[PDB]
Structure formats: C-alpha cells, structure tokens
Amino acid sequence: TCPFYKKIPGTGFTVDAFQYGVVEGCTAYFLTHFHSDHYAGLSKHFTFPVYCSEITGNLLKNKLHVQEQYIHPLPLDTECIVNGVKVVLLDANHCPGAVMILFYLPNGTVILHTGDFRADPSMERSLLADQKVHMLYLDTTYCSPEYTFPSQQEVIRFAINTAFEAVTLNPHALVVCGTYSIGKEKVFLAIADVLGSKVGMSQEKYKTLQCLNIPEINSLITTDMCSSLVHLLPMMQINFKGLQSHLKKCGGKYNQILAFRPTGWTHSNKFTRIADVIPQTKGNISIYGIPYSEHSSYLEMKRFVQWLKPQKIIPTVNVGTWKSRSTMEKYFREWKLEAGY
Ligand code: NI
C-alpha cells in the first residue's frame, strides 16, 4: 500500500509509486528520475500513463521495455495540462533526466515535489520565482549539519589533476572508474577528456549512456576496451581483488591501476579537505574515494527552503525512524524562525 507522502491531494496523481500494484484512484503515475528505488515496480507489462522527462522516457523504453503508448515525455520549463491540471517540470540538478514537479491544484494550492535534487542558487531564477508554494515534498537525504562536502567543480578538479599527473609519470597506468546507476558521468568524462581517450565499458552500460542526450557522445565513449585507457566497471568490482583480476585481462598492456569510487558523503568528510585526500594502496593498485554528491548539502538545502518559504514541508527521505523525523522537524522550525516566515 502506497504511503501518504507519494500522493498528491486533490488529484488523480502519484509520484515514484510503481511498487504498490494498482493505486486506487491514480489516473497518471509521475516518475522523477531513473533510479531503482524510485522506478521499483515498472516493467514491459505496465499499462497506465507514465509522465516524465524525455531522457527518463528513453530509459523506460530501451532499458525496462515499457511500451511506447504508455510513455508521456514532457519538455522542461513549460506549462503543460495533464488530466485537467497544470504542471511544470524543472531540472533537479541530480542525474540525467531528473526533474522536480510543480502542480497547480484546481483549488488554488501550489505544490513542489523536488524528487531527488541538489539545491542550487540558479533555482531561485527558474519559474519558481513567479509564485507562492503552499506545500514542499523535500529530498531530505542530508538534512543534518554534519553533512558537508565540496562543490562538484572542486571534486572534478581534484580527479582530473590526479589522473593527469599519474598517467604522465607512467604512460602504462590504466584508470578505472566505478558506476552502479546513472548519474556522476562527469567523473569519467572529465578524466578521459584530459587523457585524450574515449571511455571503455560493457555493452549494457554503453546502451544506458546512449539514452542520455549527451552532446557528441559518440566521440566520447566506446565498447572497444583495448582502444581506451579509461575503463568503467561495476562499483562492486572497485576493490583490490576485483582490480587485480581486471588487470590480468588487459594483455600486459598496463602495469598499474589508478581507480576512483565516487561515493556520497562518508565520515572522512568530517576531518579531511578535498585537497588532502589520499588513496588506499596495495602494490601497483591505488583507490581514491571521492565525495561527488548529487544531493543537497545541509547548507544548500537550508538556503533553498529559506528562499522558497513554504507553508508546510513533507520529507521524502529518512522518514522511517522517530529520531530522524524529530531531528528534521527541529531544523525546519529553526529555519523558519531565523528567516521569519
Ligand atoms: Ni536518485
């Protein structure tokens, strides 16, 4: 049974609600992004209307085989009528194809559902500037002040400089980057660009990247592993045993691996600056954990909410424990008293 924080009151609509069977009264199912916890339940046998971005729609058709007649892509930044209700999709600054959804209810209430997002000051100049929001359904993944991490640009700067130094000292070093979902593609694209290489990967991953509308993608990626000195591997293989085993397969072309694991936040964020990050090393293998986040930091979250001034907040993440729920409610009230709404 579908929980309350996935229903949009006063509509036939749900958000990210595909794992509950047929939801009573739902006439349109929205999907914010192609991450498995959110699409859980969709398949080629789904027969209700799905509303989403163009990129999410490419992934539903090619990767999950949802039939074309049930896929309803909408353009971004554009007022659209769905089943008699005005909606807008906005870029969420999460993974490719990820949106926030603005719903203009028949009774005059305006609701924003962030999906998963990384808040940014640029959102203060979208179509959000123009009107008031009564209810905010908020991605609260990192809603606590201990959750700090650098900008995505500082993290990519660290990765490009690290990779370029290593491979210039040793032209026989291979770079490997872990992946387990869409998102964080700038990590491996930026490193391959500095090295003058395409990125090599499995057929299954190539297929996924081909759905993403990335400009000039055919110039950037390949399934010919032999031609490439940046390889992608599943995140599970990014350990000393998995990397040893990979280096065997490369036909004595390489004698060193430098590998990257993009994580979200880890507690080594509470002590170490990005500049000071060091790898784990065993022999000719080194592994860097780099804190490349596609969710808001606590400060970015608080800035966004203090600017939007919603009348009510419904968290969508960390909702399973009383301690989490109480912590999040306390910070919402601080924010409101500090800013005066
Ligand atoms: Ni996500």
From Swiss-Prot:
Keyword NAD set for record: no
Keyword vocabulary terms for this entry: Cell cycle, Cell division, DNA damage, DNA repair, Hydrolase, Isopeptide bond, Metal-binding, Mitosis, Nucleus, Phosphoprotein, Ubl conjugation, Zinc, Zinc-finger
A GO CC term attached to the entry: nucleoplasm
Compartments reported by the entry: Nucleus
Induction comment: During mitosis. The mRNA encoding this protein contains an internal ribosome entry site (IRES) in its 5'-UTR. This 5'-UTR generally suppresses translation while specifically promoting expression during mitosis, when cap-dependent translation may be impaired.
Predominant location category: nucleus
Tissues expressed in: Expressed in brain, heart, kidney, liver, pancreas, placenta and skeletal muscle.
One example of a Gene Ontology biological process annotation: interstrand cross-link repair
GO molecular function terms listed in the Swiss-Prot or TrEMBL record: 5'-3' DNA exonuclease activity; beta-lactamase activity; damaged DNA binding; zinc ion binding
The keyword Aminoacyl-tRNA synthetase belongs to this UniProt entry's keyword annotation: no
Domain of life: Eukaryota
Protein function: May be required for DNA interstrand cross-link repair. Also required for checkpoint mediated cell cycle arrest in early prophase in response to mitotic spindle poisons. Possesses beta-lactamase activity, catalyzing the hydrolysis of penicillin G and nitrocefin. Exhibits no activity towards other beta-lactam antibiotic classes including cephalosporins (cefotaxime) and carbapenems (imipenem).
Family affiliation: Belongs to the DNA repair metallo-beta-lactamase (DRMBL) family.
Record's subunit section: Binds constitutively to TP53BP1. Binds CDC27, which is itself a component of the anaphase promoting complex (APC). Binds PIAS1.
Protein name as it appears in the record: DNA cross-link repair 1A protein
Full-length numbering of the shown residues: 700 to 1040 of 1040
